[PDB]
Structure 1
Amino acid sequence: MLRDLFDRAVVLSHYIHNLSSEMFSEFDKRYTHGRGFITKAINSCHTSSLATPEDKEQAQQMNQKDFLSLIVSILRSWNEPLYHLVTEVRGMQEAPEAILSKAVEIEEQTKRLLERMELIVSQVHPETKENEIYPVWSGLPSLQMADEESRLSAYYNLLHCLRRDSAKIDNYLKLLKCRIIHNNNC
């Protein structure tokens, strides 16, 4: 039942992106508002090496098989950093309660979304090759540094990249729903 799957997938991706945007903004307000932390967020996402469409025409040029596979790769690449975000924040003596609660929810829902996407792939493309190639995040030491300015900047980059990649995943899934179920007549 594609229609039900795509609807639930889109509910989760919209919800995840919205939570990620709110988490970023609480974190920015509370820890980095007065700074060139934004000026340092530039070109530092672990997924940036993936060929991801950046406008409507690139999205339209990308065929659906590769597109679904791209979304799955991004989501699979986020398992690792979301696990470490939650683990590290949860492990604070004084954990910012609103921030932690959102991180936990995105960690858990991102897993559920990836399950929905793998169901979608098995329906729409029953023989896509079973080979992972997703980019590796390896930013844990900078999240663990004692130097507070470096630590904070590493967290800022992580949440800025999360907010960006959840937005892409959500938008690409909305495009694919329209395309696959409605022949681009949403």
Structure 2
Amino acid sequence: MLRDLFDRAVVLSHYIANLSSEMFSEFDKRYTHGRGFITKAINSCHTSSLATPEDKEQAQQMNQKDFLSLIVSILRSWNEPLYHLVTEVRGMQEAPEAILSKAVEIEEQTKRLLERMELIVSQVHPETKENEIYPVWSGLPSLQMADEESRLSAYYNLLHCLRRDSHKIDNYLKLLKCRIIHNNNC
């Protein structure tokens, strides 16, 4: 039942997007507010290499099966950095409680969304080649650096990239809901 799945997926995506935005703001205001972190964020996202629609017309040009598989690859690619974010931060003797709490919910909620999306793909495209290819994140040594400024910069970039990709996946899923269920008459 597509409509219940899509409604649940969109609840989860919108919720994740909002939590990632609030996490990044809290980290920014607490640790990076006064400094040139934004300049070092430029071009730093592990999912950049993916070919993703950047405006409405590109989105409209993308067929639904490739679109769904795009969302799935993005989500699959975030499992690794979210796991290490939570591990690294939880293992600090004095972790920021508001930051840790959000990271842990985004980690658990992202899994649930990916489970919904896999259900959506099985209903809508029951015989796709089950093809796993997604971009690899490998930024763990930089979160691990002893240099405090390089460290906070690596965290800044991960949280900036997370805020971006969560918003993007939420927007793509809202578009696809309208397209698939409502023929673009939301």
TM-score, with length taken from structure 1 = 1.00
Deviation at 1:122, TM superposition (A): 0.1
**Aligned ranges 1:1-186 → 2 under 5 Å:** 1-186=1-186
Cα deviations by residue, 1:137-181 (Å, 9 ceiling, x for unpaired): 000000000000000000000000000000010000000000000
Deviation at 1:50, TM superposition (A): 0.4
Deviation at 1:35, TM superposition (A): 1.0
Identity of aligned residues (%): 99
Structure 1 SS opposite 2:149: helix
Runs (4+) off by over 2 Å = none
Higher deviation after alignment, 21-30 or 123-132: 123-132
> RMSD of aligned C-alpha atoms?
0.3
Q: Distance in 1 between matches of 2:129 and 2:44?
A: 30
Cα deviations by residue, 1:76-132 (Å, 9 ceiling, x for unpaired): 000000000000000000010000000000000000000000000000000111111
Q: Name stretches of at least 5 consecutive residues in structure 1 with no aligned partner.
A: none
Q: Distance in 2 between matches of 1:77 and 1:37?
A: 24
Q: Name stretches of at least 5 consecutive residues in structure 2 with no aligned partner.
A: none
TM-score, with length taken from structure 2 = 1.00
Q: Distance in 2 between matches of 1:2 and 1:122?
A: 10
Q: Distance in 2 between matches of 1:67 and 1:156?
A: 28
Structure 2 SS opposite 1:38: helix
Q: Distance in 1 between matches of 2:174 and 2:141?
A: 35
Q: Distance in 2 between matches of 1:150 and 1:107?
A: 24
Q: Distance in 2 between matches of 1:185 and 1:3?
A: 15
